[PDB]
Amino acid sequence: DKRKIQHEGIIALINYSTLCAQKCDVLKGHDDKITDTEEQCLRVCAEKIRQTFEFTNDIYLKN
Amino acid sequence: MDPVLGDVIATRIYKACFKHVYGKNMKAYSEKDEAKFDQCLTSYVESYKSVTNHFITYLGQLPKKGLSLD
Amino acid sequence: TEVSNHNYTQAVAYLNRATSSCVKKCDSLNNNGSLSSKQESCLKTCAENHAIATKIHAEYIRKLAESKYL
Amino acid sequence: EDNYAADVQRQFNRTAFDSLYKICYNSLVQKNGSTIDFQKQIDCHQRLIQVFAKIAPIVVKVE
Amino acid sequence: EMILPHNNRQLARQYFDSLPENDINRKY
Amino acid sequence: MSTRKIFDSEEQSFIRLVDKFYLGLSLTKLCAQSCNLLRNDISGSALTQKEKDCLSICYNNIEKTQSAFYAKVKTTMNLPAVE
Amino acid sequence: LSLINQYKSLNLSSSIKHNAPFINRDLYVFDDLFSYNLGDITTKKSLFNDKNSFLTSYSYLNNNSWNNNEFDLIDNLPFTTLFDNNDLFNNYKSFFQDSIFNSPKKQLSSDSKQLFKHIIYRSIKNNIIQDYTKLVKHEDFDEYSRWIKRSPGEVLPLRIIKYPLGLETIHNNIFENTNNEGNVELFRLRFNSNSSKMQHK
Amino acid sequence: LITNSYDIVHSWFIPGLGIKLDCVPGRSTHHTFFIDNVGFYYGQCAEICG
Amino acid sequence: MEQNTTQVFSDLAYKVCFKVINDKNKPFVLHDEQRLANCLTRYVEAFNVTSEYFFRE
Amino acid sequence: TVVPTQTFYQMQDYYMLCGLRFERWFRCDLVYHDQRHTKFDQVKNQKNYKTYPCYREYYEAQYACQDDMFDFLMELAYARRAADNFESDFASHELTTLPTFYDTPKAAERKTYTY
Amino acid sequence: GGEVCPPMDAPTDSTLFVNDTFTGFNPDPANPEDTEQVTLTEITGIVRRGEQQDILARRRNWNKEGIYNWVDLDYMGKIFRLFNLDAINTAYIERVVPSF
Amino acid sequence: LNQKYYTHMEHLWTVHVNRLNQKILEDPLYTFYPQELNVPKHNIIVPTIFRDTPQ
Amino acid sequence: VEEMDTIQKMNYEATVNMGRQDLITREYTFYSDYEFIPIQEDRKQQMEDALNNLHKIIHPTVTQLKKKANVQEIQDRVFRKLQGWEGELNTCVFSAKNVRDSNFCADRFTNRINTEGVEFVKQILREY
Amino acid sequence: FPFLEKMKYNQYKEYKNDYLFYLDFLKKEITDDHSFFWKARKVIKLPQYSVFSFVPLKLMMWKTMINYPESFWYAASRVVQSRRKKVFVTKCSARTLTTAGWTFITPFSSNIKYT
Amino acid sequence: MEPFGTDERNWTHEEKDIITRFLKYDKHVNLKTAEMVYSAEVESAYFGKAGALAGGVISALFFNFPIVRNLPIIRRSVIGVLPFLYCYTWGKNTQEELRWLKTFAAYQRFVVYHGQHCKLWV
Ligand code: HEA
Numbered sequence A: 001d002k003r004k005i006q007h008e009g010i011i012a013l014i015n016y017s018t019l020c021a022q023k024c025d026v027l028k029g030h031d032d033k034i035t036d037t038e039e040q041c042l043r044v045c046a047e048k049i050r051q052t053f054e055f056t057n058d059i060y061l062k063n
Numbered sequence B: 001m002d003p004v005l006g007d008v009i010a011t012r013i014y015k016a017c018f019k020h021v022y023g024k025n026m027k028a029y030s031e032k033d034e035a036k037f038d039q040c041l042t043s044y045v046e047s048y049k050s051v052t053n054h055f056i057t058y059l060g061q062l063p064k065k066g067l068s069l070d
Numbered sequence C: 001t002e003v004s005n006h007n008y009t010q011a012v013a014y015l016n017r018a019t020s021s022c023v024k025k026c027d028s029l030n031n032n033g034s035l036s037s038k039q040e041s042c043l044k045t046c047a048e049n050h051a052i053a054t055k056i057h058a059e060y061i062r063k064l065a066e067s068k069y070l
Numbered sequence D: 001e002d003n004y005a006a007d008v009q010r011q012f013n014r015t016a017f018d019s020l021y022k023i024c025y026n027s028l029v030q031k032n033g034s035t036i037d038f039q040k041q042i043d044c045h046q047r048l049i050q051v052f053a054k055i056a057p058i059v060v061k062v063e
Numbered sequence E: 001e002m003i004l005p006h007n008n009r010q011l012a013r014q015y016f017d018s019l020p021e022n023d024i025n026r027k028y
Numbered sequence F: 001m002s003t004r005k006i007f008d009s010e011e012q013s014f015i016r017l018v019d020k021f022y023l024g025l026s027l028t029k030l031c032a033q034s035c036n037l038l039r040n041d042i043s044g045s046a047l048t049q050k051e052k053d054c055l056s057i058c059y060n061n062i063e064k065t066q067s068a069f070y071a072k073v074k075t076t077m078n079l080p081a082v083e
Numbered sequence G: 001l002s003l004i005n006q007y008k009s010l011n012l013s014s015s016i017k018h019n020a021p022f023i024n025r026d027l028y029v030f031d032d033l034f035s036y037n038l039g040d041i042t043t044k045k046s047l048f049n050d051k052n053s054f055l056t057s058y059s060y061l062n063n064n065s066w067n068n069n070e071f072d073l074i075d076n077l078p079f080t081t082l083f084d085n086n087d088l089f090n091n092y093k094s095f096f097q098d099s100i101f102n103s104p105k106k107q108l109s110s111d112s113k114q115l116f117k118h119i120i121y122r123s124i125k126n127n128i129i130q131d132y133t134k135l136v137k138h139e140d141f142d143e144y145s146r147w148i149k150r151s152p153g154e155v156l157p158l159r160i161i162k163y164p165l166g167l168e169t170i171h172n173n174i175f176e177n178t179n180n181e182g183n184v185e186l187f188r189l190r191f192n193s194n195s196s197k198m199q200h201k
Numbered sequence H: 001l002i003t004n005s006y007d008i009v010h011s012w013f014i015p016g017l018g019i020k021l022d023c024v025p026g027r028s029t030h031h032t033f034f035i036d037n038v039g040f041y042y043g044q045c046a047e048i049c050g
Numbered sequence I: 001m002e003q004n005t006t007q008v009f010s011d012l013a014y015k016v017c018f019k020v021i022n023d024k025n026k027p028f029v030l031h032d033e034q035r036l037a038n039c040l041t042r043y044v045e046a047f048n049v050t051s052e053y054f055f056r057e
Numbered sequence J: 001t002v003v004p005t006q007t008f009y010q011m012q013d014y015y016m017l018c019g020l021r022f023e024r025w026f027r028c029d030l031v032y033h034d035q036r037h038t039k040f041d042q043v044k045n046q047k048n049y050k051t052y053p054c055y056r057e058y059y060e061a062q063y064a065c066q067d068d069m070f071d072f073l074m075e076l077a078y079a080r081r082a083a084d085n086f087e088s089d090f091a092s093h094e095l096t097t098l099p100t101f102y103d104t105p106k107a108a109e110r111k112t113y114t115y
Numbered sequence K: 001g002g003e004v005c006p007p008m009d010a011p012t013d014s015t016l017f018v019n020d021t022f023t024g025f026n027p028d029p030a031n032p033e034d035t036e037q038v039t040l041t042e043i044t045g046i047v048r049r050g051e052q053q054d055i056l057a058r059r060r061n062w063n064k065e066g067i068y069n070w071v072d073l074d075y076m077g078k079i080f081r082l083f084n085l086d087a088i089n090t091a092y093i094e095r096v097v098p099s100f
Numbered sequence L: 001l002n003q004k005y006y007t008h009m010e011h012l013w014t015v016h017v018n019r020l021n022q023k024i025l026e027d028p029l030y031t032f033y034p035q036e037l038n039v040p041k042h043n044i045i046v047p048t049i050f051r052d053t054p055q
Numbered sequence M: 001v002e003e004m005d006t007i008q009k010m011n012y013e014a015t016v017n018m019g020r021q022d023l024i025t026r027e028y029t030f031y032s033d034y035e036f037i038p039i040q041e042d043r044k045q046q047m048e049d050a051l052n053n054l055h056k057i058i059h060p061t062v063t064q065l066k067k068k069a070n071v072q073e074i075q076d077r078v079f080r081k082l083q084g085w086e087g088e089l090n091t092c093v094f095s096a097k098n099v100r101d102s103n104f105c106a107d108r109f110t111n112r113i114n115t116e117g118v119e120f121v122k123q124i125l126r127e128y
Numbered sequence N: 001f002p003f004l005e006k007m008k009y010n011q012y013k014e015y016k017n018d019y020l021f022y023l024d025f026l027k028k029e030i031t032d033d034h035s036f037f038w039k040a041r042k043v044i045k046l047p048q049y050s051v052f053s054f055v056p057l058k059l060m061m062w063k064t065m066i067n068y069p070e071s072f073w074y075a076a077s078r079v080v081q082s083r084r085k086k087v088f089v090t091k092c093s094a095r096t097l098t099t100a101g102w103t104f105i106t107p108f109s110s111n112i113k114y115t
Numbered sequence O: 001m002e003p004f005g006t007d008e009r010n011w012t013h014e015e016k017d018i019i020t021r022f023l024k025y026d027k028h029v030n031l032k033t034a035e036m037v038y039s040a041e042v043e044s045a046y047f048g049k050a051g052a053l054a055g056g057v058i059s060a061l062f063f064n065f066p067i068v069r070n071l072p073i074i075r076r077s078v079i080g081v082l083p084f085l086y087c088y089t090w091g092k093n094t095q096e097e098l099r100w101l102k103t104f105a106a107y108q109r110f111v112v113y114h115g116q117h118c119k120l121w122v
């Protein structure tokens, strides 16, 4: 269903945002502001996730 | 609380107990593993009781309005 | 005075997550069927921390949702 | 329509697929993102698919 | 009012870096 | 332990199947970790003989004690019947 | 006049499918990839995620989860009995006397709506998840009440207060206050932790 | 005696003691009061009030 | 379902933030509550950044 | 006596004296109002019990004022304590007051002490 | 307050019994939130534009007397204290039954 | 026009040269960035849990 | 704390209730107020530690002075510097956007107290 | 005094300018429109009669009332024999309808609340 | 908040407009102040139109006045349009003055509401 597909897409967004936040060590308690270095790390993590998913989609469409 | 939630609880317990038995040594099955599973079940039940007691106690001792003491 | 079934289930879910996290943190399953004094102290501390964190997390989520209104 | 069981099975397959892929990505990604091998990701995903295919009849069942 | 150093965007520095090498501002 | 009639029979069965599905995913991750499947040294897309044997041991262990442990937890928790 | 080019796209589904970090959903492998015993499914069943939050959403959907219960009815916990433990029973009642742990369905629905609005707008920026109305909000406060008074300006984050000296001559001591180190205090720091609450009468 | 009045001016008038204290609104008037005998004295209001 | 999406969001927020904050298993203080709030804010902002990059740069 | 009655003693009616005493008590209270339940009379245990520093000024103000005027002044005190309005935040009239011998910069050395 | 059309049938998807994201309607016959209980009727019609005054065509309305001869969507929206006056003035839907 | 702004511009240029000589490439005090360069204010402020004072 | 007579129970209830005025009034918030990010608890403790360090230096001098006028003069001289620094801190904390900015301002204020405040206090006390 | 209250007819004032729903107003149940009903001032034990008329005896015939150019106070002025001669039952006109002596004393004189 | 004194700059048109749109739409402003600014906007608008229209009518009459009607076209036009210019200026000035006086009253109410004036407290 279209609603189910949208739900899965948003859940995937949440899961991989959490994964990038954990991998970049963004979550800290000393202050609530994410520095520009951490924002760059998060964006690079998101870019790598996007590239990996493009590769996987192409491979599975070929197969 | 629907009974299925209890079933859900069981699942978590099983998962935890599994990690305590075969988490490191992936051996075969015997009565020793059954005894270890029963030990883990009892430990998890006691830990759940303790956590429930302390959680509810702390969240109920937080003041929320004027003291009555009728 | 009146608690919904959903709110009771949410309380049970709070207890479930607190119990799982305190079992993992305090190694409460590494026993002979009964908890140790050190394990009991660690479970008490972890349960109190979970109570505080649950209160703060619920307040933060409600304040975010309400800030959408404001 | 009448394929309610088929729809539920399709949802289960999609969710398991995505969860296994996320597990492999979390396990394989290195250096706060920006470093992962696409072929290694695909191989891990296939191996985890085989493992879950063996596990699903054992665990995922009714009654 | 003062802008905090972490919230300070060095726009003056950005323009300074874009200047030619033989520039009066670089001489200053 | 306070039990109520909330979900229907089919809905209860589906929720049980859903938690079994997520338990299956968790056990998939568990057997993968315990059999050294998740490593960067792997350069192939197939399971080796040792990995297959360890996975078979994991499946056997899951098979032997799942129902028994669920029954034991159900007896220990002792949820009162819904009326 | 304001709607001329405000809403470019209306389909969230297309943007989700072409941009979300998930594998393509049209693959034919999702039909018989794995084998499960699903019993009989005579109704459209939907799956919920996170392996811990599915039951909360399943209970939220159901209408029988909103039947109010008295504590004497729900006087039990999954591994603990509360009818024989009076202290824990009272703490349990106090726990459920918090408005943040005992909310009506309307509060949870509003919170879920606003959180989903936040998620969609921060992810897609599609501008259709926001409220269509433009709300102008003004505070109407009854200033003619002596029981509650607001704070003109604010109670500032920090105030340094001089301790008065010589107000007491009972034993020829002009320092009313002394800290734990034993040193007499001349100044005090007062903080305003909550910037919006009223000041008690 | 701190004499005051809620609404209008009254007069606490004790004839036996020969004293009269004017209770005036907004005026907290301090009077000294000394009675040098055991006595039950009646009195009235000596300012027109209604 | 949208409520399920928000429930997953909130539960993941609490899980990750409490794992980070409660690291030494010491009893909490008031500043520990404030640090948990800071970690939750960082989680929300990290989600904003990552999702915004995912859809377009 | 902290605030003397002799400041306004020619007047039998104590209204300016009432205002003066209440103002002094309100200054003292603005210093100590939020520490009362932790360091002063309103502590839970008598171990940490201490008399509130403004007790004498409070009783003097109560003596000088009737309950009606005291209620008016308490309404003003609430209005000024909600906003945390210390009088020193607004006071400037000392710049438009005639100089006096008591206004010397060396206030401690102005007094001559003698046995 | 008559019944123009029979109320719409309840959906067969249990996840559709929540308030809609955009319309805000809950298709729940027994809604736990009493203040959010709505009954939805589904109509089909044709979009038509509003009318204008043409005195020579004998389409003139006296608002004060209550005599109306042409569809003045602006006045109709104002008199009924409706909210989206512009989206009311733009057009209106003429209900069309299928065959009879 | 030159008479009005000659001294004002001399002071501005002198300040510019002084802060370049001191190698100050940071923005001056009264610099008000546009909307995109500003820091959004964090709305979500959660007050700490109220607890009774032991003393 | 349970076992006590009626009078003791009433006194305990009174003492408890006199401390929950902050609890009761936290629900009544105003929409039109200008909110600010408050000073964090650790920064509050650091500022109070700096104040206690200042009080450590002044204690022997003020306790060895037998004139109230001298002690009041010492209090006034320090208070002007402290009030200027407090005004700077209040401005920079009210105009703060995140907790990082509030922490920066509180750290600047504490560093001013611990660096220049002690020097100024020592000079004053040497004068006295 | 029932003839004085013009709030009774306020519902008619709405449609003096808004004719639109005047016809809808006219199709309404008649309860007290252009009529005065006086509630029972006496206990009457007559089960045969459901409703009793307590109209004043000097207002029963409108033929005499319509052409008389005077207010309806003639129906209220000394029409009962019930007198009560008790010094303590004097319900005066109003407690505030007094004077403050030939020396106008304040705030007694300068306030409508008291005079 | 505004500087006070003889040497200070008077409120410019841009400042008045910005303050008006601040008081009308911003939060931190009570409902009464915003309603004051709204009532200022509603009632002031009549005077500009009224002045312009009265000036137009008077100028139409003045273009045919006993001496104006016999003037050359340039002088006749100038003398005829003088009443229109005067009344149009009167209408615009009255509208601006009424609106700004009420808006400045609302601004004073806002300043006292948030305690943003020294030497003013309850
Ligand atoms: C002009 C001054 C004047 C006069 C003449 C009178 C006349 C009288 N007064 Fe009056 N009285 C006052 C001045 C006066 N009074 C005042 C100021 C008050 C205060 C009011 C208040 O308290 O606020 C007062 C109040 C007052 C009270 C107060 C009631 C109360 O306090 O409870 C009483 C009661 O005993 C009283 C008694 C009398 C009596 C018995 C007479 C009798 O002597 C009456 C005698 C009658 C005459 C004197 C008539 C004169 C004869 C003529 C026909 C004149 C025409 C002749 C020629 C043209 C030459 N008076």
Ligand SMILES: [Cu+2]
Binding pocket: H009, H010, H011, H045, H046, H047, H048, H049
């Ligand atoms: Cu009297």
Ligand SMILES: [Cu+2]
Binding pocket: H010, H011, H045, H046, H047, H048, H049, H050
């Ligand atoms: Cu009297």
Ligand SMILES: [Mg+2]
Binding pocket: H011, H046, H047
């Ligand atoms: Mg008198």
